[PDB]
Amino acid sequence: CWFGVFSGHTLGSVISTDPLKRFFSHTLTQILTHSPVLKASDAVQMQREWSFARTHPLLTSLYRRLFVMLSAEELVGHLQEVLETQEVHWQRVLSFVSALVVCFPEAQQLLEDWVARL
Amino acid sequence: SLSSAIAKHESNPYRKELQREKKKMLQTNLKVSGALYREITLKVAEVQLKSDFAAQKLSNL
């Protein structure tokens, strides 16, 4: 029900998407940043467990909602900025890229762009 | 009551195919009944008259 109200169909309708966008950006940063446990550089086999079908459907739905109310290249820039700046929860970032590649309209090349830069 | 009455008149591969569908439901309704807006502007005009009437007793004193 908490992710249900987060789904900005009842919200985005009523609320202008200026302070709503900073809310979603802060929400993404606070999902990624908070409890950066499994910071092990050896979190390689765990990619298979962070596969899209194994990552909980509610996480997936939240990611879909955040993608609806925001844009692609904004989000890619924001990820580059975050992952370069500060610590990460690798569970959420790997599930997140797993959702990114399929949900966004061919963002495997805009992804390999900042991969090449990094 | 203007903006609230208006805000009720506005309410009135697999994951790509759901993402795009939910974008379609929330395609910003940029549009608002002129008729409704007009209704409310009359109601407001009504009140303006008293309030303006009130300011004049005040900017006497």
UniProtKB/Swiss-Prot annotation, chain A:
It is found in: Nucleus; Cytoplasm. Phosphorylation is required for the formation of the nuclear complex. Not phosphorylated in cells derived from groups A, B, C, E, F, G, and H. Belongs to the multisubunit FA complex composed of FANCA, FANCB, FANCC, FANCE, FANCF, FANCG, FANCL/PHF9 and FANCM. The complex is not found in FA patients. In complex with FANCF, FANCG and FANCL, but not with FANCC, nor FANCE, interacts with HES1; this interaction may be essential for the stability and nuclear localization of FA core complex proteins. The complex with FANCC and FANCG may also include EIF2AK2 and HSP70. Interacts with FAAP20/C1orf86; interaction is direct. This is Fanconi anemia group A protein. DNA repair protein that may operate in a postreplication repair or a cell cycle checkpoint function. May be involved in interstrand DNA cross-link repair and in the maintenance of normal chromosome stability. It comes from the Eukaryota. It is linked to Fanconi anemia, complementation group A: A disorder affecting all bone marrow elements and resulting in anemia, leukopenia and thrombopenia. It is associated with cardiac, renal and limb malformations, dermal pigmentary changes, and a predisposition to the development of malignancies. At the cellular level it is associated with hypersensitivity to DNA-damaging agents, chromosomal instability (increased chromosome breakage) and defective DNA repair. The chain holds residues 297 to 414 of 1455 of the full protein.
From Swiss-Prot, chain B:
It is found in: Nucleus. It comes from the Eukaryota. Belongs to the multisubunit FA complex composed of FANCA, FANCB, FANCC, FANCE, FANCF, FANCG, FANCL/PHF9 and FANCM. The complex is not found in FA patients. It is linked to Fanconi anemia complementation group B: A disorder affecting all bone marrow elements and resulting in anemia, leukopenia and thrombopenia. It is associated with cardiac, renal and limb malformations, dermal pigmentary changes, and a predisposition to the development of malignancies. At the cellular level it is associated with hypersensitivity to DNA-damaging agents, chromosomal instability (increased chromosome breakage) and defective DNA repair. Some severe FANCB cases manifest features of VACTERL syndrome with hydrocephalus. DNA repair protein required for FANCD2 ubiquitination. This is Fanconi anemia group B protein. It comes from Homo sapiens. The gene is FANCB. The chain holds residues 772 to 859 of 859 of the full protein.
